[PDB]
Amino acid sequence: GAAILPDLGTEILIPVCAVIGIAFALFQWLLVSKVKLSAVDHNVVVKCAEIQNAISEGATSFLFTEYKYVGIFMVAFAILIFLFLGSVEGFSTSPQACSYDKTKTCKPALATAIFSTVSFLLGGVTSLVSGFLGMKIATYANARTTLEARKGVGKAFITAFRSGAVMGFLLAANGLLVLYIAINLFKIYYGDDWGGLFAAITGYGLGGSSMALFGRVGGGIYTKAADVGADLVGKVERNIPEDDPRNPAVIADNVGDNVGDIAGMGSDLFGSYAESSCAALVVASISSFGLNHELTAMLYPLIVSSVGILVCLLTTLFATDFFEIKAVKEIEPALKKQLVISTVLMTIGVAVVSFVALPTSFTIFNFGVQKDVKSWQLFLCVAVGLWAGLIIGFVTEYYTSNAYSPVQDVADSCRTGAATNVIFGLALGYKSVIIPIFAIAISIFVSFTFAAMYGIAVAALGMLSTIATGLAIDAYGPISDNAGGIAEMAGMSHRIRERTDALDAAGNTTAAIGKGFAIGSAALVSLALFGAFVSRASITTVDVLTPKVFIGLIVGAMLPYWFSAMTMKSVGSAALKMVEEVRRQFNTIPGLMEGTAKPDYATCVKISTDASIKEMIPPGALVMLTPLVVGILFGVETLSGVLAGSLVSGVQIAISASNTGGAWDNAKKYIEAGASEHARSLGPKGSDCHKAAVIGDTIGDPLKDTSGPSLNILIKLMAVESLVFAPFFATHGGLLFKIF
């Protein structure tokens, strides 16, 4: 029953590792501070800092506005959680038999309605902090990356990567510490009722993904309205460089990288980490670990995350200290080495944890039955998710980097115009899904076989065990992106812009890899939650060949398309207005095209701000309302169908959308760099091939930055939301069938 590592060791180990992670993060923010700049060569440093401030102000301003709406919605929804969950036992204050063991007595369900609302708000707040902190580091390091670019690629790379690491370790450590705290606080009330305790904790993931949904969508709309509008009028119509200070949309564009690609992404991944941890905990809570009250083994998922931070710490040193980039061709291999190193070290890490934090034999809850599991099997569950992640990263890099043929072929197809560029890009994205799906399927088979829903949850966490590194190589990208925009806006040398362009291109690839991990883990966690939901709702079998389940399956499969329709149309409409606005200033403001006059940046920011705040509402509504509407009107069988179908369907469109968009971007970068003869043959900038590439790039903008990455949230959010309201649905739901 007991492991080698005693409960008190666990209670110490977790927050120690968290603090080590925060410590490391602050240490990296410190080093990045060594780069000095102020708005008070010398003219360059002053201009860079002025631009950084405009961006830092715009990003802070939008997030405050966005988080305001989202926080209000957060509060409203929390009221629904309390009400709906409280209504199950008529708000009784009396104890009841345990849902998991009739012979025992548990804390009243109304308590759980209360601690669920508590953990929901905890998660929601931690999610906003995750996004906001990320924006803070990014809007700090961007111009510092620009300035270090004067000294070479390797130096600007380090600044950007150190800064990515700040965000990665802060998110990973803060998310772990809040959960640890919440579990220990909650335990004070629950005592021996670990079932109710971890059922309450489940709201944490629900809160995390709930806020992330609006952050990803809202930020996504803001950024891509500007991106499309700036690039179309500037590069395609007016023949001026990307990020040219004459272009009124450039401030919104570069703000957008921080507000969407950074803030939205940070929340997103926090949601992933939280739901994965919660799912594991919820199944363990009614397995031998939870039933025999064994704290160490019970917190196996948090112990894994803990070691993950230390592993990622050692890994990061390989890129900041033990090596330096001399050639631009070294950048992408550097970033990929981060993944390989962490995966290898963490395979050793998890072996150790599995050896010391688990009994050699235990049981796992398996649809009403205690299944015999061995710790070496649980090691394989974690590890399969971990290696599936590496596989997914390798495949994604293959399809999105311009160092390989798929993207080079897409760039090449620009010789025959924008239409062929788009057909090839679409085809590439569709093609890209094949290996990720097999990886995910293999992970499911292995983990489902060994340890049912617990194994699957713990494979999700395995895929996210190295999340600090993952966030690092991902957050590195938009920082490099802003760095290039700043360089250009500060009229710096063409040689500076070339360095950042190389950093940026690698960042396009790592952003796609980040999305791969998000989609991979969302598939796994959603399946685990789905299985948990099925038990919690007292369903005997989810039989596909029943009218209730099947209509759910086909409708569930349709939801990701509905969601994508909304988000694509929003960006399209906003971008249309942006283009019309940028054109207006070019056509009416005297001397703007000449460099005489100043553009009005604030009107473009307003277009994307208005569009995002308004248009993020319906897609958020669709995802949040779906489980409630289906569960209440149609019942838990039909919701089971919806969950399965949205999972298997949404994953395809998510992967293809992200990779297509990533590919179009790097095909365009390929042409812009002119780093080979083939590349140079499609140039120079302004050529018909380059313009065709830009068309493809801007089509991919909403695909990879608005709809695409948000779909992983649509899937995991509905899953955890369904689990949380399961007792309510199973009691007060299925109405259309009760009355007819």
The annotation places the binding site for substrate at 224, 704
Separation of alpha carbons 90 and 728, rounded Å? 11
**Residue whose CB is less far from K ion, 477 or 599:** 477
| 232 counts as binding a copy of itself under rule CB under 8 A | yes
Is residue 203 a contact partner of residue 118, using CB atoms and an 8 Å limit? Answer: yes
Binding part of the chain for a copy of itself, among 128-136, 329-337, 387-395, 554-562 by CB under 8 A, reads 554-562
Binding part of the chain for a copy of itself, among 333-341, 510-518, 557-565, 595-603 by CB under 8 A, reads 557-565
**Residue whose CB is less far from Mg ion, 219 or 727:** 219
Shortest Cβ 52–Mg ion spacing (Å) = 15
Q: Which does 416 bind (CB under 5 to 8 A by kind): Mg ion, a copy of itself, K ion, none?
A: a copy of itself
| 604 counts as binding a copy of itself under rule CB under 8 A | no
Sequence-ordered list of residues with C-beta below 8 angstroms from that of 533, at least 6 positions apart, any chain? 636, 639, 640, 643, 719, 722, 723, 726
**Residue whose CB is less far from K ion, 261 or 412:** 261
**Residue whose CB is less far from K ion, 511 or 528:** 511
Residue in this structure with the two tokens 């709906």, named with its chain if needed: 84
What's the angle, vertex CA 282, arms to CA 278 and CA 283, rounded to 5?
A: 125
Binding part of the chain for a copy of itself, among 18-26, 308-316, 524-532, 668-676 by CB under 8 A, reads 524-532
Separation of alpha carbons 21 and 26, rounded Å? 9
Contact pattern for K ion over residues 454 through 493, marking x by CB under 5 A? -----------------------x----------------
Binding part of the chain for K ion, among 34-42, 204-212, 411-419, 504-512 by CB under 5 A, reads 504-512
Q: Which does 148 bind (CB under 5 to 8 A by kind): Mg ion, K ion, a copy of itself, none?
A: none
**Residue whose CB is less far from K ion, 511 or 605:** 511
Shortest Cβ 481–K ion spacing (Å) = 5
Binding part of the chain for a copy of itself, among 53-61, 211-219, 417-425, 590-598 by CB under 8 A, reads 417-425
Q: What three-state secondary structure class fits 283?
A: helix
Shortest Cβ 555–a copy of itself spacing (Å) = 6
Is residue 268 a contact partner of residue 276, using CB atoms and an 8 Å limit? Answer: no
Encoding tokens for residue 1? 């029953």
Shortest Cβ 574–a copy of itself spacing (Å) = 10
Shortest Cβ 511–Mg ion spacing (Å) = 7
Q: Which does 542 bind (CB under 5 to 8 A by kind): a copy of itself, K ion, Mg ion, none?
A: a copy of itself
Site for K ion in 509-548 (CB under 5 A): 511
Residues that bind Mg ion (CB under 5 A): 227, 231, 257, 481, 508, 665, 701
Q: What three-state secondary structure class fits 128?
A: helix
Binding part of the chain for a copy of itself, among 5-13, 43-51, 427-435, 462-470 by CB under 8 A, reads 427-435
Shortest Cβ 301–a copy of itself spacing (Å) = 21
Encoding tokens for residue 335? 């970033």
| 310 counts as binding a copy of itself under rule CB under 8 A | no
Shortest Cβ 274–a copy of itself spacing (Å) = 23
What does the CA dihedral 347, 352, 357, 362 come to, rounded to 10 degrees?
70
| 422 counts as binding a copy of itself under rule CB under 8 A | yes
Separation of alpha carbons 361 and 3, rounded Å? 10
Is residue 417 a contact partner of residue 696, using CB atoms and an 8 Å limit? Answer: no
Beta bridge partners of 106: 96
Q: Please state the residue numbers annotated as binding site.
A: 224, 227, 231, 257, 481, 508, 665, 701, 704
What does the CA dihedral 301, 307, 311, 314 come to, rounded to 10 degrees?
150
Shortest Cβ 700–a copy of itself spacing (Å) = 10
Q: Please state the residue numbers annotated as binding site for Mg(2+).
A: 227, 231, 257, 481, 508, 665, 701
| 545 counts as binding a copy of itself under rule CB under 8 A | yes
Distances (CA, A) of 688 to 264, 498, 681: 34, 21, 11
* HSE-CB of 593 using CA atoms within 13 angstroms: 14
In 10 A of CB 361, how many CB atoms?
11
- By CB under 8 A, name the one of 35, 558, 589, 675 that touches a copy of itself: 558
Separation of alpha carbons 345 and 466, rounded Å? 10
Q: How far apart are the first and last CA of the chain?
A: 51
**Residue whose CB is less far from Mg ion, 508 or 722:** 508
Is residue 51 a contact partner of residue 40, using CB atoms and an 8 Å limit? Answer: no
Instruction: List alpha helices for 191-292, DSSP H.
Output: 194-201, 203-231, 250-256, 265-284, 288-291
Q: Which does 477 bind (CB under 5 to 8 A by kind): K ion, a copy of itself, Mg ion, none?
A: K ion
| 289 counts as binding a copy of itself under rule CB under 8 A | no
Three-state SS letters, 454-485: HHHHHHHHHHCCCHHHHHHHHHHHHHHHHHHH
Site for a copy of itself in 677-696 (CB under 8 A): 694-695
Beta bridge partners of 73: none
Encoding tokens for residue 343? 């995966």
| 417 counts as binding a copy of itself under rule CB under 8 A | yes
In 10 A of CB 399, how many CB atoms?
28
| 712 counts as binding a copy of itself under rule CB under 8 A | no
Sequence-ordered list of residues with C-beta below 8 angstroms from that of 340, at least 6 positions apart, any chain? 390
| 507 counts as binding K ion under rule CB under 5 A | yes
Is residue 524 a contact partner of residue 457, using CB atoms and an 8 Å limit? Answer: yes
Q: Which does 227 bind (CB under 5 to 8 A by kind): Mg ion, K ion, a copy of itself, none?
A: Mg ion
| 240 counts as binding a copy of itself under rule CB under 8 A | no
Residue 430's Cβ-count burial label (10 Å; 0-12, 13-18, 19+) is middle
**What does the binding site for K ion look like in residue numbers (CB under 5 A)?**
477, 507-508, 511
